[PDB]
A paper describes a structure:
[name] catalyzes the DNA ligation reaction during the base excision repair (BER) process of ASFV genome. [name] is composed of 419 amino acids and is one of the smallest DNA ligases identified to date. However, unlike the homologous proteins (such as HsLIG1 and SusLIG1), the fidelity of [name] is very low. By solving four [name]:DNA complex structures, including the non-catalytic open form and the catalytic closed forms, we showed that the NTD, AD, and OB domains of [name] undergo a large conformational change during the catalytic assembly.
Among the three catalytic structures, [name]:[name] captured one sealed C:T pair, whereas [name]:CG and [name]:CT1 captured unsealed C:G and C:T pairs at the catalytic sites, respectively. The structures belong to two different space groups: P212121 for [name]:[name] and P21 for both [name]:CG and [name]:CT1. The molecular packing of [name]:[name] is very different from the other two structures in the crystal lattice. However, as indicated by the low root mean square deviation values (rmsd, about 0.75 Å based on the superposition of 404 pairs of Cα atoms) among them, the three complex structures are very similar to each other. In the [name]:[name] structure, the template C11 and the sealed T12 form one H-bond (2.9 Å) between their nucleobases. However, though the pairing and overall shape of C11:T12 pairs are similar in the [name]:CT1 and [name]:[name] structures, superposition reveals some subtle conformational changes at the local regions. Compared to the [name]:CT1 structure, the C11-T12 pair is shifted about 0.5 Å toward the main chain N atom of Gln403 in the [name]:[name] structure, which may exclude the C11-interacting water molecule. Meanwhile, the side chain of Gln403 rotates clock wise around the CG-CD bond for about 15° in the [name]:[name] structure, leading to the formation of one H-bond (2.9 Å) between the NE2 atom of Gln403 and the O2 atom of the T12 nucleobase, thereby shifting the conformation to the ligated product.
Residue numbers in the entry: 1 to 116, 120 to 414
The structure:
DNA sequence: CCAGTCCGACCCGCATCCCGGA
DNA sequence: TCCGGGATGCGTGTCGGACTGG
């Protein structure tokens, strides 16, 4: 019935069981997902026939409640379920059975990358972009520069049963990279089985889109390689980066004859100009950039997507200009009503860019106030500068795109 | 009083499943 | 059978804001 779903029904509201993660500062945090039943600015009971038939001018509103160990308590701007989906088909979800599976999805998703997950640890993420905090060189040992490969990141560890567990940055297990997993098992017969190996799934001269497809697919072509750049034990996380790289180096001397598993090569540096000279080298060899790691930096897992300040990536930030043609709007929660641009290419294929340095207070206005009559007089045809990481190799659309501003500025 | 977290949305691209119509 | 739409959930990531730890 309705109790298919975990949680408690009270006060016209069904909130799911709290999931509780620990903040980096050691404290306990709680997070609540809840659903309501608004009709004409009012709250209504919870039936078992809103899962069967829709009530007129009745929408379900899903909101989130997050709070610390009793500090301030947020409520999120409601996300309005106006309709169901697949309504003509045999999978027609009414607007409440759908809101209750939309919220239940967020329950299963939100568990990962927290402090639990089969014993997986989220990999460490870098903080600084084209910045090397000068404290990296003010230590007893020099930092390390290695290349950065435009691929999908994966962590390998051996579970108790002896099988190989290869998971992603959000703690999702990769499937069917059997060739890599095969030489991972052979390798684990010679090393401390409690070790984690941190690297990038990658195959040189292949786009990121192709590498991403091979990883997330159940079946696989078994051509990818695994380039390990770091290792750690769940026990000793404070082990400085310089030490971890030295054990990893001898891990790969326990077997120097593999096809799909290779250790990322390490370079020691004493100034910024050495790193950039290596960074320039890496991009001409075809790679994405360079990674700099503080010598005495611990391993800080990416819980709640936390980015460690002991790492930096040096990578070209690409800018170009694209013809503005139209405007649009977000669709869920806080972005409901926020402006988004629509650019267009020579080939005349269109895409969306989120503006930058614009308050949500602004973006609500520039969507409500703008009119096709007004827009056309002032903004249509102008050139929008877009920052991006790379061009879509199959459409030329800039991916990871941001709108910094125009060439002929406006308001 | 901040710098530091953490959240809650989002681009495009890809993989898969379930759907019915051909 | 194949060929879609529609929906979902991955990946590389993005940024604003609302908090909070020191
Ligand atoms: Cl390398």
């Amino acid at each position: 019935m309705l109790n298919q779903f975990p949680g408690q029904y009270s006060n016209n509201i069904f909130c799911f069981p709290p999931i509780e993660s620990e903040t980096k500062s050691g404290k306990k945090a709680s997070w609540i997902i809840c659903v309501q039943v608004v009709q004409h600015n009012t709250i209504i009971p919870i039936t078992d026939e809103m899962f069967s038939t829709d009530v007129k001018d009745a929408v379900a509103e899903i909101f989130t409640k997050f709070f610390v160990e009793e500090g301030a308590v947020r409520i999120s701007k409601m996300t309005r379920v106006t309709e169901g989906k697949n309504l003509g088909k045999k999978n027609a979800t009414t607007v409440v059975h759908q809101a209750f599976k939309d919220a239940l999805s967020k329950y299963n998703r939100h568990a990962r990358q927290k402090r639990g997950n089969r014993g997986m640890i989220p990999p460490m993420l870098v903080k600084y972009f084209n910045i090397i905090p000068k404290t990296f060189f003010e230590e007893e040992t020099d930092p390390i520069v290695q290349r950065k490969r435009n691929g999908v990141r994966a962590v390998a560890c051996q579970q108790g049963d002896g099988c190989i567990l290869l998971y992603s940055r959000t703690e999702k297990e990769f499937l069917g990279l059997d060739n890599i997993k095969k030489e991972l098992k052979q390798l684990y017969l010679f090393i401390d089985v409690r070790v984690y190996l941190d690297g990038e799934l990658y195959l040189h001269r292949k786009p990121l889109q192709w590498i991403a497809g091979q990883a997330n697919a159940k079946t696989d072509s078994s051509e990818l390689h695994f380039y390990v750049f770091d290792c750690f034990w769940s026990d000793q996380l404070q082990m400085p980066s310089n030490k971890r790289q030295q054990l990893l180096t001898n891990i790969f001397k326990q077997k120097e004859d593999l096809t799909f598993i290779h250790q990322v090569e390490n370079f020691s540096v004493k100034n910024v100009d050495e790193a950039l000279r290596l960074k320039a080298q890496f991009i001409k060899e075809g790679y994405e950039g360079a990674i700099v790691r503080n010598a005495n930096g611990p391993y800080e897992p990416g819980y709640n997507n936390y980015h460690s300040a002991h790492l930096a990536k040096l990578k070209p930030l690409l800018d170009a200009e694209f013809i503005l043609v139209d405007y649009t709007q977000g669709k869920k929660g806080k972005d409901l009503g926020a402006i988004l641009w629509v650019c267009e290419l020579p080939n005349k294929k269109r895409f969306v860019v989120t503006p930058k340095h614009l308050t949500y207070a602004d973006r609500y206005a520039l969507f409500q106030k703008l009119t096709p009559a007004l827009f056309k007089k002032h903004l249509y045809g102008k050139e929008l500068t877009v920052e991006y990481a790379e061009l879509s190799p199959k459409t030329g659309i800039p991916l990871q795109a941001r709108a910094v501003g125009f060439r002929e500025p406006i308001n």
